[PDB]
Amino acid sequence: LRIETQLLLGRLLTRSGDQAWDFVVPFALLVIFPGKLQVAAFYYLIVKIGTFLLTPSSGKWIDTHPRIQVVKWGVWLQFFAILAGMVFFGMLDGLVRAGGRESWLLSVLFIALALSGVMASLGSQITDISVGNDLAPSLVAPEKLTHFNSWLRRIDLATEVGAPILAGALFPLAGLFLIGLWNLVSFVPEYFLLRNVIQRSGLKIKVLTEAINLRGSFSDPIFWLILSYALLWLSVLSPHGVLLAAYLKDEMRLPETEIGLFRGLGAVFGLISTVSFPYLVRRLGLISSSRWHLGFQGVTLGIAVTAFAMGSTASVYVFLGCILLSRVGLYGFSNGEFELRQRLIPEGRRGELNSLSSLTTTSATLILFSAGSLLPQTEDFKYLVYVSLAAVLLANVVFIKWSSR
Ligand SMILES: [K+]
């Protein structure tokens, strides 16, 4: 295998395990604390807030250590976080099965679980930045990055579609530990693949920074590109969106069978961007392809939101169809912004400025989570819809302004 293929193979193996694990954790939480959806929510919250708080530090840590150290800590932090998580899950499940109720002990084990979730999430973010935003632009010719990124996207979508299937086959909570085990094992090929390409090549030579402040990050021009991407995470208009599903079910009275297919079609339209975006790049260049895809997301969601406004079931399939089309735009733009970060971010600032990107997208996630919790009613879904559209149009404005560079 050539270098580029080794990178993709490593990503494919470790992701299939990551996606399988992320899929089953909420269900495992619900098995242990039956009914209590607030507990699963609390888990997710701690992980995200935790990752948020550790992000600037981790980006400085990335720029000040050799790559082989970054990859070692990135992967093995995950490995041992997942192992710790499995141990705490087992303990929790054992405790509750044996009749344990609310206690400091049970609480302490939940916190230990949630913190291990923070470590894994942070390790994963470090590894993504390292492989996708440092190793890849250092190993792959600039003109072949678009091709390389489209395969990274295909791996992400494929393992995303394969996750419920994998999990299904393997699934009290015995399925969880089998998924945990597969996840553990799936970290190992990527560690050694990465370690061996670093050991044998010029990745060893890298000037490190000695030895937060975020003023330097936010003041950099690339932050506006970063903001144009992050804004897209604010939307409730997604195939997987829980508030949209709730809305479609109660207000639109769509059958649950049609809602599930809609949800499942997300991946397909994501996959379509991996053909449309590279095609436009090769024809119009990276900036122009990005602008067209982002505009396509803006137009299709504009149409979808007009169809939502005249709130008839006579317009519901155009609403859903346009949301699905918009995913082509979103997934295309996401590869473009990713590639612009690969190409434009100085080598010595790869940890810093890409962690800024993680910081801003995690913030968007937290806001979206906050809005979901604050406006949980289907009759209020209307307001989240208009703010989602506004965010997308603002993203277009910000990117157009930025791409005047
Ligand atoms: K993994």
196 annotated ligand-binding residue: no
The 10 Å CB-count burial string (b at 16+, else e) for 271-303 is bbbbebbbebbeeeebbebbbbbbebbbbbbeb
Please give the resolution of this entry in Å, rounded to 1 decimal.
2.2
Q: Amino acid letter at 154?
A: R
Do 90 and 31 contact (CB within 8 A), yes or no?
no
Which residue is it, tokens 């919790």?
373
Q: First vs last Cα of the chain: how many Å apart?
A: 38
Distance CA 25, CA 156 (A): 19
CA dihedral 153, 291, 387, 230 (to 10 degrees): 50
For residue 260, report the distance from its CA to the centre of ligand 1, in Å.
27
Tracing tokens 């440092």 back to the chain, one arrives at 134
d(CA 3, CA 167): 31
Q: Is 18 annotated as a binding residue?
A: yes
CA 184 – ligand 1 centroid, Å? 6
**74 CA → ligand 1 middle, Å:** 11
- Tokens describing residue 322: 């346009």
Angle subtended at Cα 50 by Cα 91 and Cα 235, rounded to the nearest 5 degrees: 110
Q: Which residue has the tokens 């030895």?
A: 211
Distance CA(84)–CA(45), nearest Å, equals 19
DSSP per position, 173-241: -HHHHHHHHHHHHHHHHHHHHHHHHHHTSGGG--PPPP---THHHHHSTHHHHHHHHHGGGG-S-STT-
297 is in an annotated binding site: no
Q: Which of 367, 299, 288, 376 is nearest to 333 (CA)?
A: 288
Contacts of 343 (CB under 8 A, 6+ apart): 137, 142, 145, 286
Kind and range of the H or E run holding 285: none
